[PDB]
């Protein structure tokens, strides 16, 4: 019953945090998990499966992800608004697909990864980014619902 994009992205970010940098979980992510509240385990089978797909996407498109992210983060003032802006730019027509979703979620996870590992990123930047990605991503909920949830979506 994986019908919450906020929860699956949050659980994916937490799983990713264990595989990267110094391992330890950024307090922004711990607070997001408490507030949601996050009911998915970072070890749930659906999180594990998506994590494998998102990692492949990040590896295959690493140059593009680095370069788009770098251009994104040059302006940190309104990161929360800009995440919504990019999300809505991709999906506003109301024609989502598995690949568009996966690209988006891969991009978000990559961002979190780049932000949380770097000791020279200010707290408030990490906070706005996480809050921004999670809030923007809730836009996929209605579409994922129609598809029978995140779990059903990769069955085909």
């Amino acid at each position: 019953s994986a019908y919450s994009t906020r929860e699956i992205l949050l659980a994916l970010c937490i799983r990713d945090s264990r595989v990267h940098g110094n391992g330890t979980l950024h307090p922004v992510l711990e607070l997001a998990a408490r507030e949601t509240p996050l009911r998915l385990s970072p070890e749930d089978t659906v999180v594990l499966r998506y994590h494998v797909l998102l990692e492949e996407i990040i590896e295959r498109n690493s140059e593009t992800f680095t370069e788009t992210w770098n251009r994104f983060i040059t302006h940190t003032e309104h990161v929360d608004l800009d995440f919504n802006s990019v999300f809505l730019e991709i999906f506003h027509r109301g024609d989502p697909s598995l690949g568009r979703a996966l690209a988006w979620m891969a991009w978000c996870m990559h961002a979190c990864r780049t932000l949380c590992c770097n000791q020279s990123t200010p707290y408030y930047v990490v906070d706005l980014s996480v809050r921004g990605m999670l809030e923007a991503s809730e836009g996929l909920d209605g579409w994922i619902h129609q598809q029978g949830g995140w779990s059903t979506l990769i069955e085909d």
Partner: protein
């Protein structure tokens, strides 16, 4: 109906997808070269660039996924053997890697032109 038809339909879709991104980035450049573009207008173009790059990656992923599913259906119907199934999926992967490179380089070219006009 056969491996060449699966691979051909996917190649055209990945080329179509790649062409759509090239055209989007050309539109964005033309906007970027307008006079009295303000800082908000510039930022809006940067965000549209990111969205285009993401939509291209997602759309390539879709085309190839679909082709692989259609390849599976051939194997399940007994219309290709193991060799031919794997050979087909190998070819679909090369196609994905080639499309992915062209998309990457369209983005690079855009960024460089945005920096200096």
């Amino acid at each position: 109906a056969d491996p060449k038809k699966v691979l051909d339909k996917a190649k055209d879709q990945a080329e179509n997808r790649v062409r759509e991104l090239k055209q989007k980035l050309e539109e964005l450049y033309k906007e970027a070269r307008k006079l009295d573009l303000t800082q908000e207008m510039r930022r809006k173009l940067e965000l549209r660039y990111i969205a285009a790059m993401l939509m291209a990656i997602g759309d390539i992923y879709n085309a190839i996924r679909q082709a692989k599913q259609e390849a599976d259906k051939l194997k399940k119907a007994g219309l290709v053997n193991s060799q031919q199934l794997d050979e087909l999926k190998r070819r679909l992967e090369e196609l994905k890697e080639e499309a992915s490179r062209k998309a990457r380089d369209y983005g690079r070219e855009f960024q460089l032109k945005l920096e200096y006009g």
